[PDB]
Amino acid sequence: SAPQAKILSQAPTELELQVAQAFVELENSSPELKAELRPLQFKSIREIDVAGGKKALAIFVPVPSLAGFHKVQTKLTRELEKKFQDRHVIFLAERRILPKPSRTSRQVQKRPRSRTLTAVHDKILEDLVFPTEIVGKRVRYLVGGNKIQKVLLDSKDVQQIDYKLESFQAVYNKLTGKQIVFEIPS
């Protein structure tokens, strides 16, 4: 019934639709790009300023979907960056966060560990770099009081985010409030 305004949930906004036709562009490539790309819509995008003369794109995928977006993440992110100069592309599955239950803010039926602030923030970072896993973290409490979380990314295939690395920081910082710093094996 629709190739364009369909491949996305809820109507606003424009930059999305702009991206949407970038999605239907690849959809004209039947056996592969038309295959596992029609099930993959997204919820929303937020633009964010980076350190250089560009900006990064936070595409908020749902959750059960995030599996498939990952399988195309390699190709799709790159083709997106071809059709978008001055834009770093990152996929961020939006996860629900539940408040730490309280005598006030109470909710029956427990509260899974995955709806945890610190647990979701922990996944945001996993997705905010997608390929290349992490081999360690640190947290530095600076002699004046403030945390700086050092993330240690693999040496394998970092090439796909070696440059975005400077941008990933501002993404995280916008979402949460905590400052990142990345680094590599030696």
């Binding site: 896993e133 081999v135 360690g136 394998k156």
Partner: protein
């Protein structure tokens, strides 16, 4: 340190910093599960299952590569045992020791060791009763013990 020995050993495993991975595995959870159940129906314990999977089938762990620890899978498939593997092997053990006592009756060390093992069994079963995996009463009986390990 040790519970019943006076030993202070640290010989343990060492699980890797890697809740995901391995990049060389390539076999999908759904597949490995159907191998676990294959073995569990051929009468095999979680311990000695993940021993085969760690060895011949190059599957490092089960909580990774499937998202679920082995016994949890067996229970879902209704291949949950009657009493737990620890409790079991303890009860089997205590049985055999007693069976040795019954002919060699001067083995005072034997008797001593039984007192240790059966302490363990009860301590266990107590906990297992506490978290609903054994019925409120249960308790390990010696006279009936040989039966429970068949």
């Amino acid at each position: 340190g040790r519970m019943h020995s006076a030993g202070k050993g640290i010989s343990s495993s060492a699980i890797p910093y890697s809740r995901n991975a391995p990049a060389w595995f390539k076999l999908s959870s759904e597949s490995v599960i159907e191998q676990i159940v294959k073995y569990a129906r051929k009468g095999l314990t979680p311990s000695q299952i993940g021993v085969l999977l760690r060895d011949a089938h190059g599957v490092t762990q089960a909580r990774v590569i499937t998202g679920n620890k082995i016994m949890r899978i067996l229970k879902s498939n209704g291949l949950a045992p009657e009493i737990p593997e620890d409790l079991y092997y303890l009860i089997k053990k205590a049985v055999s020791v007693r069976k040795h006592l019954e002919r060699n009756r001067k083995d005072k060390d034997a008797k001593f060791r039984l007192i240790l093992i059966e302490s363990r069994i009860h301590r266990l079963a107590r906990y297992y009763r506490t978290v609903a995996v054994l019925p409120p009463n249960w308790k390990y009986e010696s006279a009936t013990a040989s039966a429970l390990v068949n």
